[PDB]
Curated annotation (Swiss-Prot), chains A, B, C, D, E:
Organism: Homo sapiens (Human)
Keyword Kinase attached: yes
Name the UniProt record assigns to this protein: Phosphatidylinositol 4-kinase type 2-alpha
Domain of life, per lineage: Eukaryota
Reaction equation(s) it catalyzes: a 1,2-diacyl-sn-glycero-3-phospho-(1D-myo-inositol) + ATP = a 1,2-diacyl-sn-glycero-3-phospho-(1D-myo-inositol 4-phosphate) + ADP + H(+)
Region (Important for substrate binding): 87-89
Disorder association: Neurodevelopmental disorder with hyperkinetic movements, seizures, and structural brain abnormalities: An autosomal recessive disorder characterized by failure to thrive, global developmental delay with intellectual disability and absent speech, seizures, hypotonia, inability to walk, orofacial dyskinesia, involuntary movements, and structural brain abnormalities.
Full protein segment contained here: 78 to 453 of 479
Keyword Ubl conjugation: yes
Ligand binding (ATP): Y61, Q62, G63, S64, S65, G66, S67, K82, Q177, L178, F179, V180, D246
Keywords in alphabetical order: Acetylation, ATP-binding, Cell membrane, Cell projection, Cytoplasmic vesicle, Disease variant, Endosome, Epilepsy, Golgi apparatus, Intellectual disability, Kinase, Lipid metabolism, Lipoprotein, Membrane, Mitochondrion, Nucleotide-binding, Palmitate, Phosphoprotein, Synapse, Synaptosome, Transferase, Ubl conjugation
The gene coding this protein: PI4K2A
Region spans: Catalytic loop: 221-229
Quaternary organization: Associates with the BLOC-1 and the AP-3 complexes; the BLOC-1 complex is required for optimal binding of PI4K2A to the AP-3 complex. Interacts with BLOC1S5 and DTNBP1. Interacts with FOS; this interaction may enhance phosphatidylinositol phosphorylation activity. Interacts with ITCH. Interacts with ATG9A.
Tissue-by-tissue expression: Widely expressed. Highest expression is observed in kidney, brain, heart, skeletal muscle, and placenta and lowest expression is observed in colon, thymus, and small intestine.
Primary role: Membrane-bound phosphatidylinositol-4 kinase (PI4-kinase) that catalyzes the phosphorylation of phosphatidylinositol (PI) to phosphatidylinositol 4-phosphate (PI4P), a lipid that plays important roles in endocytosis, Golgi function, protein sorting and membrane trafficking and is required for prolonged survival of neurons. Besides, phosphorylation of phosphatidylinositol (PI) to phosphatidylinositol 4-phosphate (PI4P) is the first committed step in the generation of phosphatidylinositol 4,5-bisphosphate (PIP2), a precursor of the second messenger inositol 1,4,5-trisphosphate (InsP3).
Length: 353, 353, 353, 353, 353
């Protein structure tokens, strides 16, 4: 029916349903569905629930201004939430990027912290490191988040959606990282271990965890890893665990102008001279040296990243080019039984496809 | 020394000191000095003090999103603070006004609520009504006010001024109205009085207070007087007092397009039919019928108003033209022993100078 | 003669001579006169001389693309020259700065490397540290510098100035740092000393030098000090000397967004835990705690900085505000016999005047 | 399958492969393949090879700033390379052409020297003159070419392409003309011949070569032929050869405003009065008087020319119109046994199609 | 006191009074004062008076849409009022003139009808012709004029000026021409006279009047004189009078492109062949041939014309240049006892000063 009334009717079926799909996309996102990870989705519902019952995510007192401790309805801290528009460069929305070079010393993209945060977790899972607490992109509305004067006043009047939902403040997008319990700043424990050495079996464990951290931080090329920035959990009377937690500043789009800037702080630790174990070599090498694994990972990051309103294909390629370079270096250092310290000394490479 | 080296040196004395004055004006304002009213200034210091000791002005739960209960260091509520940039139209700063007509149904100016608030108090004092709690333009900085993401992050780092002041968040300008104790919504009491009439002596008092309210609300042509909006204080075992408290929406720049919109809600009360007393006639008439009193008042409002960044001489004339018209009507109704109700029925006049 | 023919003639004396001064300013700068330091000026003449005789400054092979080893007519390396327009952000000349915020993660100004370079030397002298080899702002023309295609072709034809000078390529402005002989990367020596400890008297010397480095790097808040970046000279059969040499990335305009980025690399050395000596306390404290010394230094930097075409008063204040903050911290740590390591741990302060 | 799923899939086959073709076009060009002339391609590989082994094309000392002597890995000069962006008007890239007339005295196009250079060779081959050394459009990257500050710094970091190529500096496009050995400035020999006349047989040879030069220079209407600009090779104890070498300024788009400007310098030589031989008449006439030969040549030049980013169809027609006019004049002078001198005296014609 | 406090105070006397003068100029104009002609001013007051008492100027039924019959309070027609903004090209206010040539066939200025109207009267008086009824530039406000929707609604609300004037609609500027009684279309009478000739004495009178018309229409170069356009008053049982009444389209800025367009319609009448009398020659020649009279007249028109908001000095010169040309021709034809018909046949001249 190439030019017939039967087809022109079908084209109008598609037209109006595609406009129905495009109208109701924002509501579909703000629903927070994770078919692929029900355990996480549960914790989000729990977060949403305490919000209704009026137990509000509270600002983190000593950290940044942009991060919140999400509480469950009982009162327990269950997650950390960092909203996109509460990041430092949260303004500058009318993308002003193409106007700038058509620059600069900056090596990170402008306002995609929450996506770095989420992407770190995504690389973690793909590599099976389990050091980054599951963290995903999530919508949340709360009295305690930083809204604008207009946003607040608009929201005093009763509003209803249509499925007769009440509408509070506009939900903010951000990273929602699962909170983990009984951990401490890596350096706190690290210096105690210096005073008291650990039983060699336990210490062998700490070292396996630490290697995983190195791998993760090298691939995403974290910009901001201190030794206060990862966490160690350790209880004596016997397991020891690390948690990689502050990954808002990774996935740069070029290696920094000077090598000295943005160092990996763990590279100065004595642990860093210990050559990579076999355990890490056959957990990681089978993956990162398969071109399909890297191809598949790149695409996972593409999907996650595109979500952002400000997404730029040009940037994403630059970002991936850096990562490829890291993967390359890492592969080498893994094949030659080198150590984390050796790895950070290898000259940075970019790989263009 | 009209073109000599002795004078050219004196001109450079003036140049650099006038630039020193213009540099350090913002710090001079944010200091909150009131030579003319030390009692008020004291309460501001007290507000500033609790801020340092970490007793923060808290958001008013049931009212608007833009208003805060300032507390003293003890915990007592001492003032209401409404910041300019937390008003509904707080955005729209790059004055976009001349671009609009060179409009509209709107009869109030855009973002000068705090000045209406302050101006109401200023008219109160000039007329000696003492129904508006002293309220002035004040700078305050606090964790609990609504700042932007940038403003917050910028302020985590230690900053010092130079007289080695610490610098918190940037101080906000707004209205700072003295809080008054033991009052209730005018209509709460008003309906009780209907059930229980008041002793005629007390009732005569309520009526004197009420006349003052009428006068104030008519001259500034309040846009937003409900009967929940003014307050009555009354304790039995014998004085009764009114408080005019929510004057953010007065000093319009034209009479509203339709007379029916923005009514004075007290005009429907039975009290409003009672003709103006002698007490009010010789408290007000000697003032508002002296052209110099009005001239002097206009200039007080000019000085207060100009403070605003968005101030517009064109608007201020329109504003004053309306007020003159009200004063005119009021003068008439006062000379002819008319009642508040009669007064609100008189056709609105504008007076152009 | 306020409006007379005698004065109008004098005003024309000034008009045409001020236009003569403004015409011939560029030639006056490109002359490289240093009344205040004849020893340096000599070395510049020597550099200019080898240029004529065709001994060309050669590109530094392993470093950056923007730096040249200036040779005397004999062949000896006598200076390092880094031209402004060969810096990384050398383009972007039509100042596009005000168009950007009226940003950003960048904490250094755009294209003022040569001035940081020169300013470091200027702070050195003022404090009498003598660890930075004298370095000033200098004009040089050479075949080997990176010119544009036009600049090169234009310069094949014979040109003459008028004092019948020949004109080669257009002279470039940059930093001209005196070359120092027999030094090596600080870490080269530092690790040898670890194998072989130094005689305690010599080692006490190394420590006095090192303190000076700390002081310099903290005040200008160098962004880019590695342990390959300063140099140690040491000959055994007994003095030891440091040279602070790569100061192109100091005088930031804000403390970096994250404390972890741009660390001072010497802070990890064991030397850094040794508390500040008396020798440094009475060489520096008498200076940096006199408000006039700081006032005088600020003005020296102002004069040097303004030279740049892109200079911005707004930036320069931000820059000075940072430095004041450093001076403040430094003063404290010097009074309390603290160590360099303690000093870098003190929270960064900004001081606004 | 005009609107079916089988076809929509095929359209996506084309879409993504055409985008793959368009992505990887620049890499395809920078490869320098000449199926049609393997002997030339070889010399390019040889040039590329010495570049890797670090034998760099060196600047031509006495000529222009834009030309380089390409060396093979042995050290021998094998080619002359003139990059497009090192031509005099190499800037002005954002084509600013249509903005200019919607002018001027200029009769050559702005920045297509390398194409004139290449086109001269292309006309040579088509006419079988063999006086222009084979010269084609070629990409080359080298330390010694004139790059920008950014281009240089960007290229210090290791980069890799993906077929795991290393990436040096960005390759420049230009003309790559085969270097020819043992030649001298035409006038050098020409004046010696005046002192010593040549054996009449040899001299008859010189004259056949010279006619070919005339033909070539007249058709492309070279703008810049001196008598230092073509070369004669001559060895006594017996052949003599000319080489037409500097053809960067031909293919004008109009005849010059004044006939006197841009003369053909050989027209003043005594040789120029000698009428065209039969040898040239039946080598050239059979060609240039066949309309198909001219049609075919025009299309060869079209293909070569379009390569340029700045190409303009409007200009190319004007260019071809001039050439047609020359061909016309030339045909005439060839039919009537006229001499080169007669030919240059014939009034310039333009032929529009 | 050239730079003293005594003078700076006097300069502020001038500043604020000159701003007082400039503020209250519009009110000063809208007052309609004619010191120089009290008889006219009276009739304006009378017009204003009937307006208040609600006897409104009524639209002229058969003429243009822009003209009104002003009535006195009794009901008698006393004047014709043509408002500027009711002319055909009344829009186009934001002068768009300089944007047009930096054109055209149009030979009149855009929207200055009322000034032509007024200027005709002004030329009449200066020459003492007394055929144009006194007409001046006048402000009037009336319900019946054509106002905009906004103008009307704005004016329902009571407004007062400050000398406690009420404010009706905004007053319009226009021409206010005295109405004259018992006249008829010139051609009505003219054709009757053809049937009945007039007594020769009366006819001699008609001819003197007619000459005056010719003079007036030629000098201002009326564009639009029909024979219905001037009026004759004639009563039998003995004077006869003409009235020149519709002069809205004179003072062109160039002679029309074609001579045939805009003819003087009286030129076809038989009267027009009768040579100019002595009476007109010594009433006009003594004037128009004195250069000072013309100089003085030009300045009177300048003053009148400048009033217009759209006034343009460039145009006014062109206008005066045309008139000078007419005066020149007229002078000639008056000296040589020529007739009106001869005069209109003389080629148009422009005279530039
Ligand atoms: N997923 C997590 N589980 C447990 N503790 C966390 C987690 N994320 C952050 N923290 C802790 O909470 C605080 C939050 O700060 P962080 O998220 O690192 O950003 P910043 O310090 O820049 O605000 C830190 O003390 C950190 O140790
Ligand atoms: N100066 C004051 N003294 C005492 N009570 C006040 C004062 N101002 C406001 N209130 C009370 O506090 C609440 C604040 O609301 P208000 O200032 O009227 O603005 P909104 O209701 O629009 O937020 C009201 O309940 C009012 O009764
Ligand atoms: N003033 C100086 N005296 C002696 N050696 C120097 C001096 N400046 C730099 N060098 C040395 O020369 C090289 C130049 O590099 P440098 O100026 O540090 O910048 P980059 O390494 O970024 O090019 C380094 O090896 C350094 O050790
Ligand atoms: N293809 C070639 N073969 C041999 N010699 C050449 C060739 N091209 C140029 N030369 C010689 O090398 C020098 C290069 O200059 P040229 O290419 O003519 O441009 P310019 O003189 O404008 O730089 C000249 O001396 C010329 O004689
Ligand atoms: N000053 C005047 N005195 C007497 N009658 C007039 C006067 N002006 C106009 N009229 C008459 O009133 C009518 C008005 O028309 P007029 O002013 O000529 O312009 P239009 O015909 O274009 O509207 C005409 O009939 C004219 O005869």
């Amino acid at each position: 029916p190439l030019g017939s009334p039967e087809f022109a009717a079908q084209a109008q079926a598609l037209a109006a349903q595609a406009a129905a799909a495009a109208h109701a996309a924002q509501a579909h996102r703000e629903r927070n569905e994770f078919p692929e990870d029900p355990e996480f989705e549960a914790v989000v519902r729990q977060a949403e629930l305490a919000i209704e019952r009026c137990i509000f995510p509270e600002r983190i007192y000593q950290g940044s201004s942009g991060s919140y401790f999400v509480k469950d309805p009982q009162g327990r801290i269950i997650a950390v939430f960092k909203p996109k528009n509460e990041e430092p460069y949260g303004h500058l929305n009318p993308k002003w990027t193409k106007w700038l070079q058509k620059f600069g010393r900056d090596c990170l993209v402008l306002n995609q912290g929450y996506l770095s945060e989420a992407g770190a977790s995504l690389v973690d899972q793909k590599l099976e490191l389990n050091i980054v607490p599951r963290t995903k992109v999530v919508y949340l509305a709360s009295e305690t988040f930083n809204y604008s004067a207009i946003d607040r006043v608009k929201s005093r009047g009763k509003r209803l959606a249509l499925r007769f939902n009440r509408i509070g403040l506009p939900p903010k997008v951000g990273s929602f990282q699962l909170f983990v319990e009984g951990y401490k700043d890596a350096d706190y424990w690290l210096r105690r271990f210096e005073a008291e050495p650990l039983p060699e079996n336990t210490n062998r464990q700490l070292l396996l965890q630490f290697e995983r951290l190195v791998v993760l931080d090298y691939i995403i090329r974290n910009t901001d890893r201190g030794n206060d920035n990862w966490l160690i959990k350790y209880d004596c009377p016997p397991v020891i665990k690390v948690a990689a937690i502050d990954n808002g500043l990774a996935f740069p789009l070029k290696h920094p102008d000077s090598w000295r800037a943005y160092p990996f702080y763990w590279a100065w630790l004595p642990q860093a001279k210990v050559p990579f174990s076999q355990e890490i070599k056959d957990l990681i090498l089978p993956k990162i040296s398969d071109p399909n694994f890297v191809k598949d990972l790149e695409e996972d990051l593409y999907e996650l990243f595109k979500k952002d309103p400000g997404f730029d294909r040009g940037q994403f390629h630059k970002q991936i080019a850096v990562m490829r370079g890291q993967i390359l270096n890492l592969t080498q250092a893994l094949k030659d039984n080198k150590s984390p310290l050796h790895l950070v000394q290898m000259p940075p490479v970019i790989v263009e496809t």
